[PDB]
Amino acid sequence: SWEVGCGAPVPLVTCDEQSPYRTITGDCNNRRSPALGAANRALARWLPAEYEDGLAVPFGWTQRKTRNGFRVPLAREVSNKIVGYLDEEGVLDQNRSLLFMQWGQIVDHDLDFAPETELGSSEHSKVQCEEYCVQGDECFPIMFPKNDPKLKTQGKCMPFFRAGFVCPTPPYQSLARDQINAVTSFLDASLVYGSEPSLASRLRNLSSPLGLMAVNQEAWDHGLAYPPFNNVKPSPCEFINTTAHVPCFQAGDSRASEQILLATVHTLLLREHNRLARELKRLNPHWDGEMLYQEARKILGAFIQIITFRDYLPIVLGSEMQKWIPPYQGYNNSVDPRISNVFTFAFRFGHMEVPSTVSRLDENYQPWGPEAELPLHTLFFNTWRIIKDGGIDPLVRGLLAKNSKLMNQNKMVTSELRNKLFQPTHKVHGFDLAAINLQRCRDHGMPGYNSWRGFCGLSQPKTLKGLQAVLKNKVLAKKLLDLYKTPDNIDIWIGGNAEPMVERGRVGPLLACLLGRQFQQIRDGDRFWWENPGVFTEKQRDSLQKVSFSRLICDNTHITKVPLHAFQANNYPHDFVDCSAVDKLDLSPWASREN
Ligand code: HEM
Ligand SMILES: *[C@@H]1O[C@H](CO)[C@@H](O[C@@H]2O[C@H](CO)[C@@H](O)[C@H](O)[C@H]2NC(C)=O)[C@H](O)[C@H]1NC(C)=O
Ligand SMILES: *[C@@H]1O[C@H](CO)[C@@H](O)[C@H](O)[C@H]1NC(C)=O
Ligand SMILES: *[C@@H]1O[C@H](CO)[C@@H](O)[C@H](O)[C@H]1NC(C)=O
Ligand SMILES: *[C@@H]1O[C@H](CO)[C@@H](O)[C@H](O)[C@H]1NC(C)=O
Ligand SMILES: [Ca+2]
Ligand SMILES: [Zn+2]
Incomplete structure (x- = not known):
């Protein structure tokens, strides 16, 4: 097709080839092609990119240039007309805790990040785009x-900068533009340890030989660590x-600090690493810092994998789970x-699961203080x-005792995200995540809704009546066709999320296929999958079998009352048990005998 290995990534990688531990960058996972799944490479293209000039320009860039004979509607107009709603009453997911939404964001951040381009430290363009909307x-x-x-109160536009892409950071005009994934594709706790050697080290505590991650020295959480x-x-x-x-x-x-509950979950995982490294020291006093770090890291990575695949994915995918992610059969090095690229939009289904407020709860799981409940945007x-x-x-108590937002065809994304999003370097709580998602779909050259329907073996509605069905x-469906004149032009993010949810799941058939396929691949193609x-x-695997988010909480906070099934909707005190009833991670099998 085009250069089979296009230039300008890091070349200075040598594979140990016998190291029992993952690299930080993801390199060396696949022995036959060591760059596969490594950070700072091109996102994979399951389908050829679709740009208005066939190379790099997004549909919607040139006003006259149509898509399939029709103009694509403004991202912010699709947001207003379809995505938004006024009434927060009744939108809550009766059977998913707020933790369910939060874990999704965690898993997503482990797997992908396509950062905005740089090209201007001294940049005024940064101001030409924001100030003048040109x-x-x-x-x-x-x-x-x-x-x-917003036209009345915020000027003519919301600033938006195109995602970074491989090879040159300046645009190239021979092959299709490919966006970068800046984190490791493997579900491997890279959101905790970093995806770059440079960061991984700064995060570590290399003052003591205890394999600890560095912690806040300024502030403590009643004797517990902060990042x-x-x-x-x-x-x-x-x-x-x-x-x-x-x-931050x-x-x-x-x-990590984008919102308070993400920072919260990151705090729990950092605590878990140090806790694990302390127990590993007790059992093995002879283990040096590097061994302790690596071994704790590897345990945490398995924890993330198990919670995700055993607890999270079945209640996202529902009836489709088994269809796309069958029981594990071992490592397959033929799997990519x-x-x-499409997955990074598919996983955005989480945006419709985010409720308008966040609560602090006391020990009786009752309002913590006068301002117990806060609007999401102030967080x-x-x-x-x-x-x-x-x-x-x-x-954490709120994460347990409060509900996620339920996706709703009439109430897709809370205005806390739709109208009040705050972006760094930008000054106002006045951005629109939904518009951004749609603009980003186009930025990334996404094929449309029906292309993905076909990809998934699903029917491709061509009329109003087909789309209604x-x-x-x-x-x-009328609103979608009024804006997109054909379902062929419907951006994948809104198309996929518009579909009704599969039985026992929280996404439609299209998304369950895109998500299901991706997770099947990240598991089957991971040489360091916990169950490989x-x-x-x-013996270790038997111990890992009993990890729970309930136990993570007990072990790493001063919460003593938790539900067994943390992702379902749980009410206190009924659905809550004392931590003493909750299975612990038995680290005994990690005891390493020298004699
Ligand atoms: C604030 C934001 C959230 C919570 C209050 C939130 C939540 C989620 C969940 C729950 C997700 C999955 C279950 C999820 C997925 C992905 N997001 Fe989102 N998210 C908040 C805010 C943002 C912002 C801002 C972005 C960047 C938008 C852009 O295109 O510039 C964002 C992105 C993503 C994303 C793509 C990541 C990538 O590969 O680059 C998800 C897969 N989220 N979020
Ligand atoms: C910024 O943070 C400060 C510091 O916590 C907040 O001020 C606190 O707010 C209430 C008064 O309404 C008091 O209970 C705290 O003691 C205050 N501290 C101080 C130093 O004033 C303030 O509310 C925050 N401001 C915004 C805009 O978020
Ligand atoms: C480094 O670890 C030592 C020993 O446990 C501890 O005293 C110190 O606070 C740690 N430093 C950081 C930055 O985490
Ligand atoms: C391994 O993956 C390849 C390509 O994805 C697939 O064709 C093959 O069926 C897989 N092997 C097994 C044993 O499933
Ligand atoms: C709540 O969800 C769980 C899976 O998380 C499921 O087993 C249970 O049947 C659900 N309850 C109801 C009332 O649907
Ligand atoms: Ca990762
Ligand atoms: Zn305390």
Whole structure:
């Protein structure tokens, strides 16, 4: 097709080839092609990219250039008309805890990140795009439709910058533009440890030979650790509160502080690593720091894998689970473990699971203080509410006792995200995640809804009436066809999420196929999959079998009352048990005999 190995990634990689541990970058996982699944490479293309010029320009870039004979509608107009809603009453998922939404964001951050291009440290373009809304090069602003309230209060557009792409960072015109995945495709806790050697080391505590991750020295959570602050400026977490001056955290993944409950979950996983490394020291006093770090890292990675595949994916995929992710059959080196470009949009189904508020709960799981419940938007890049307002525990209780938002054809994305999103370097709580998602679909050259329907062996509606039948919704289908004149033009993010949910699941048939295929691949094609014979010992695997998010909480907070099944909707005190009833991770099988 085109250069089979296009230039400008890191070349200085040598594979140990016998190391019992994953690299940080993901390289060396697949022995026959060591770059597969490695960070900072092109996202995989399950289907050829679709750009208006066939190479790099997104559909919607040139006003006259149609898609299949029709103009593509403004991202912000699709957002207003279809995505938005007013009434938060009744939107909550009766049988999914708030943790269910949160774990999805965690897994997503482990698997993919396509960062915005750089090309201007001294950049004024950064200001030309934001101030003047003039589209050029990497600046691809989201223009407001006429009648948009933001036009009255926010100017002519929301700034938006095109995703980074492989080889040159300046645009290339021989083959199709490929966006970068900056994190490791393997489900491997890279959101905790980093995907770059440079970060992985800064995150570590190399002052003591105990294999610990560095912790905050400024602040403590009633004797429990926080992540270290990221001390680089300008910091958006300091920006959102001038007076508090609390910086964002520094985790293995840069997005850790985007919202308080993500920072919260990252805090729990950091604690788990240090806890694991302490127990591993007790059992093996002869183990050096590097061994301790690696062995703890490897345990945490298995923890993430098991929670994800045993607890999370079955309640996302429902009846489709078995169809796409059959019981494990061992490592298959013929499988491409790379995250596909389309998956990074498919996994965005989580955006419709996010509720409008976040609660802090006390020991009786009752409102913690007068302002117990807060609007989600005041919690973007908010670390001060953690450090200066009771720590992680009240937030973890809310994660357990409150519900995710239920996806709803008439109520897709809360205005907390739709109208009030805060983006770093940008000053207002006035962005639209839904518009961004749609603009990004186009930025990434996504094939349309029907191309993916075909990919998944599903019917391809061509008329209003066909789309009504597929979506089981007359009003939604009319709105979609009014804006997109053919279902062929419907951006995949909105198309996939518009479909009614499969039995015992939380996504439609199209998404279950795109997600199902991807997760099957990341598992089957991972040489370090926790259940691949030889990765762990059989005795170790028996111990790992009993990990639970309930136990993670017990072990790493001062919560003593937890539900057995943390992802379902649980109410206190009935669905909650004392931690003493909860299975523990038995680290005995990690005892390594020297004599
Ligand atoms: C704030 C945001 C969230 C919570 C309050 C949130 C939540 C999720 C969940 C629950 C997801 C999956 C179950 C999920 C997936 C992906 N997101 Fe999202 N998300 C918040 C905010 C953002 C923002 C901002 C972005 C970047 C948008 C852009 O295109 O510029 C974002 C992205 C993604 C994403 C793509 C990641 C990538 O590969 O680059 C998901 C797979 N989220 N989020
Ligand atoms: C910024 O953070 C500060 C510091 O926590 C918040 O100020 C606190 O707010 C209430 C008063 O309404 C008090 O209970 C705290 O003691 C205050 N501290 C101080 C130093 O004033 C403030 O509410 C935050 N501001 C914003 C805009 O989020
Ligand atoms: C490094 O580990 C030592 C020993 O456990 C501890 O005293 C110190 O606080 C740690 N430093 C960081 C930055 O985590
Ligand atoms: C391994 O994966 C390849 C390609 O994805 C597939 O054709 C083959 O069936 C797989 N092997 C097994 C044993 O499933
Ligand atoms: C709640 O969800 C779980 C799976 O998470 C399922 O087993 C159970 O039947 C559900 N309850 C109801 C009432 O649907
Ligand atoms: Ca990863
Ligand atoms: Zn305490």
